[PDB]
Symmetry: C3
Subunit: 227 residues, 3 copies
């Protein structure tokens, strides 16, 4: 049962596309090899979300999972998006703060586990088992946020004020936003359906656009990205 949410899908598609476009049109002249990296990553993010929102607006990113007492529409494309998208975001933060490869690898891996585990949960037929997965995925996330908030902040304090500041903002943004997803999941049509898929998609759209475009804007608009 997925059609009334089309409005947010289409609006999500537009925002992602324009957000991409805008970022593209801004990274052209950039010559700094460091600023360059930030534009690539930050541009790639909305670009991926674009293709996936579009896949949902066209019905491809929509699937049917049997559980509870019916056939439930699971928008799988979200994970296909988040799988490459979340780690890309983390990467931005990693470069910005100049984290160790080991911590970068540890996060990228914790992130893939988080989205991968989330996809399993979203497709699992045993209604009760869907929450075990949600539980594993959320632990994965709290680990990621734990590092971002405590480990990275410490690494940022050693950079110049501009970088420290932009990181702080960015950090606060992603942490507050990333944790909303599990709560949305838990109350949406994929978990304990308290909110209809209609509103679910809306919350996810606002969140997504904020976690990427909004995120990107904040970052790409700082001198923090330069050496």
């Amino acid at each position: 049962t997925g059609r009334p949410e089309w409005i947010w899908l289409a609006l999500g598609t537009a925002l992602m596309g324009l957000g991409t476009l805008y970022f593209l049109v801004k990274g052209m002249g950039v010559s700094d090899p460091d600023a360059k990296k930030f534009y690539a990553i930050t541009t790639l993010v909305p670009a991926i979300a674009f293709t996936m929102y579009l896949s949902m607006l066209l019905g491809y990113g929509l699937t049917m999972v049997p559980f509870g007492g019916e056939q439930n529409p699971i928008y799988w494309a979200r994970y296909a998006d988040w799988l490459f998208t979340t780690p890309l975001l983390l990467l931005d933060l990693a470069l910005l703060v100049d984290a160790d490869q080991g911590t970068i690898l540890a996060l990228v891996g914790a992130d893939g586990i988080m989205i991968g585990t989330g996809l399993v949960g979203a497709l699992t037929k045993v209604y009760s088992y869907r929450f075990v997965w949600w539980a594993i995925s959320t632990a994965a996330m709290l680990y990621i946020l734990y590092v971002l908030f405590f480990g990275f902040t410490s690494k940022a304090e050693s950079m110049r004020p501009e970088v420290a500041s932009t990181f702080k903002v960015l950090r606060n943004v992603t942490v507050v936003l990333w944790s909303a997803y599990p709560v949305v999941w838990l109350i949406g049509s994929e978990g304990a359906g308290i909110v209809p898929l209609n509103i679910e998609t809306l919350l996810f759209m606002v969140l997504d656009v904020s976690a990427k475009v909004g995120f990107g804007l904040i970052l790409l608009r700082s001198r923090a990205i330069f050496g």
Copy 2:
């Protein structure tokens, strides 16, 4: 309806396998840590194509997608191949020219979008929607080729003549070849069926073998790969 094309699949399998074998038997003695990288990448390419051509010759890489007024055989394995294969190729070019990580990341990402988007298009049931995807994927490609042709060429001009020259050839080859794929797609059984899957596969075989083995030969046969 996929069986008369078996001949090109089998021939594609043989060429990929021997192409791999030959490359393997050539990288053995190589000690230069730089030449080493080029052999790995360039060897891995046909090796992947091998497994995928074989998957098509055995019926595994073949699927059925409903669209238009019938059930259409979509060789999905092509994308499974191209997904790892195209970026690997790009990587070769990146090392050769010594491109910035940011541009390397930007291309790898543009490439994954291109093949990923292509796979969606190839599996999309709404006949008309298949061209939207083709349209997104082709834009992705033109971006990649734009950088290769203009950005990379500039980066190569700063290398020694041997490297500049080999890049030029390589560049001209991949650009001319990579753009044939969308045209083939557009006229083949996955788009506006003007050419039968039978000939489609043939064009794809010639193209593939050229874009990899041919490509590999040109490169591995130059001193351009050495420091």
Copy 3:
């Protein structure tokens, strides 16, 4: 027909989880940026296996493939695990020995081919074709082991005794273990069913736990991981 093996799945889940937990609780204080990398990789490994063993214990990682004269339960999750897990393991060995990027790339690629090819074999409907894939995958493996045993050993001889020693042990362990998998596959319910899926899973559990936790223990317990 997959239920009597539940016992090994559940025990596999517990061991992977605790193995992860234990490793996590050990990498906390570690400050050395090199030791850090080893903890990330080595911790991520069992963590992945955890999620996949769990997926099998809950029925999600189980699928049905038609071949021979019946419907056969294929535990696909094993490959989803091994796909990220085997290369991670290799990576540990690569860092430990400080191998060239080209050889690291060549192995990672040979490994993905090995698991990818194995997954195809495990899902291939033409009973006879399943062994062609097994044959390709095993060649892939023998290449990996060839390098580990001969190429890496040579690279390790140039490190300090502690590192050389830990590598030797590790090397001997992975080589002896990794080769058991194809033999198990060949005699298990996925190949020439001589052993029942029940015992198959047991052998795979012992193997897995050994190839990761056991492996991890040996490594993380040496000073070899420090600069």
